[PDB]
Design a protein around this ligand. Structure first.
Ligand SMILES: Clc1ccc(-c2c[nH]c([C@@H]3COCCN3)n2)s1
Ligand SMILES: Clc1ccc(-c2c[nH]c([C@@H]3COCCN3)n2)s1
Length: 340
């Protein structure tokens, strides 16, 4: 690669390691914020729009219930999420601004990205044109080049985890499955449609699973539906491990070629995992019109700017029942979360 790229990644790794070895902790508390709206909710956590009472700034606060994290066997994953988020820095990664814990919950206070999930915009428009898909895909390629160089595997690429910012660029959220891995790792995690075959087959797997998931994402952005779709996970998994993929006739020949190499069942033949690494992807004909430096510098005009009224607008997110943020008078699971 160009020495300028090698030196950039060397500095990125130095800066990551300094924060990784000495993580920040306990940098705000709950009563510094007003709660505004629930933006999403799941089996152990939720994300809420909040406003900082002294500065007036808006943030997305991810709240995890310690007891539910323990019950669902997510302790190590939640510790990974916060330790990685406080150590990374890249244009297309959502920034963690504060973190803290109390008797009941863990809190990660992130920048608020008001344009909403890519998923909403994709389903609204139906499918993205190839140039539009390629603009987003280029940002993911650069983000994975960065993360992988730090020995991080992301493991949760899907349209719901990619938010669109005020300039139309991506911000990757949700580091709940991200992990620092030199070599292989073994956990079954991720969403069914996006799982690589070696995850489904319970193998020791590596960063190649992120490049498989990029193939699924590009397919879904350009078609409007994912390549291995079926009604139940076991049926999805059978399709994935066969790897038989059908492409819409409107796909360009270059797009089909790139996707056959990303959706390669044999991980030892998959683009992103060969001797030339990410450069087999960046140099592929489907990306011939991409100016990688201009994307990194955010100098390319985006295909689409989300419609919103200001930094507190929640119109691009949906409506959930509003539940209390209860804090027990007694400390729960203190040992398990000591390092958070
Ligand atoms: Cl992943 C990435 C790999 C290499 C990257 C890179 C190389 N050079 C730059 C920028 C361009 O000008 C502003 C600062 N340096 N990024 S990103
Ligand atoms: Cl604005 C936002 C900033 C950060 C957000 C965030 C972090 N983690 C999640 C996930 C998405 O997938 C499943 C569970 N909650 N959103 S949204």
């Amino acid at each position: 690669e160009q020495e300028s790229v090698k030196e950039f990644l060397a500095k990125a790794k130095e800066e990551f390691l300094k924060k990784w070895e000495s993580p920040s902790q306990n940098t705000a508390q709950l009563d510094h914020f007003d709660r505004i709206k629930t933006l999403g909710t799941g089996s152990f956590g939720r994300v809420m729009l909040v406003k900082h009472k002294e500065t007036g700034n808006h943030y997305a606060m991810k709240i995890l219930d310690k007891q539910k994290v323990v019950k669902l066997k997510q302790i190590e994953h939640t510790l990974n999420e916060k330790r990685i988020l406080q150590a990374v820095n890249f244009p297309f990664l959502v920034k963690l601004e504060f973190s803290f814990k109390d008797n009941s919950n863990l809190y990660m206070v992130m920048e608020y990205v008001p344009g909403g999930e890519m998923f909403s915009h994709l389903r609204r428009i139906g499918r993205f044109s190839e140039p539009h898909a390629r603009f987003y895909a280029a940002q993911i390629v650069l983000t994975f080049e960065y993360l992988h160089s730090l020995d991080l595997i992301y493991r949760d690429l899907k349209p719901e985890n990619l938010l669109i910012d005020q300039q139309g660029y991506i911000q990757v959220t949700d580091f709940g499955f991200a992990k620092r891995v030199k070599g292989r790792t073994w956990t079954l995690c991720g969403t069914p449609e996006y799982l690589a075959p070696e995850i489904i087959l319970s193998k020791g797997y590596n960063k190649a699973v992120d490049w498989w998931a990029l193939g699924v994402l590009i397919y879904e952005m350009a078609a409007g539906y994912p390549p291995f779709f079926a009604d139940q996970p076991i049926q999805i998994y059978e399709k994935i491990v066969s790897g038989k993929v059908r492409f819409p006739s409107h796909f360009s020949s270059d797009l089909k070629d790139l996707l056959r190499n990303l959706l390669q069942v044999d991980l030892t033949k998959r683009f992103g995992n060969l001797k030339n690494g990410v450069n087999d992807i960046k140099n592929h004909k489907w990306f011939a019109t991409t100016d990688w430096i201009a994307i990194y510098q955010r100098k390319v005009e985006a295909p689409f700017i989300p419609k919103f009224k200001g930094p507190g607008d929640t119109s691009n997110f949906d409506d959930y029942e509003e539940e209390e943020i209860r804090v027990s008078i007694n400390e729960k699971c203190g040992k398990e979360f000591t390092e958070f």
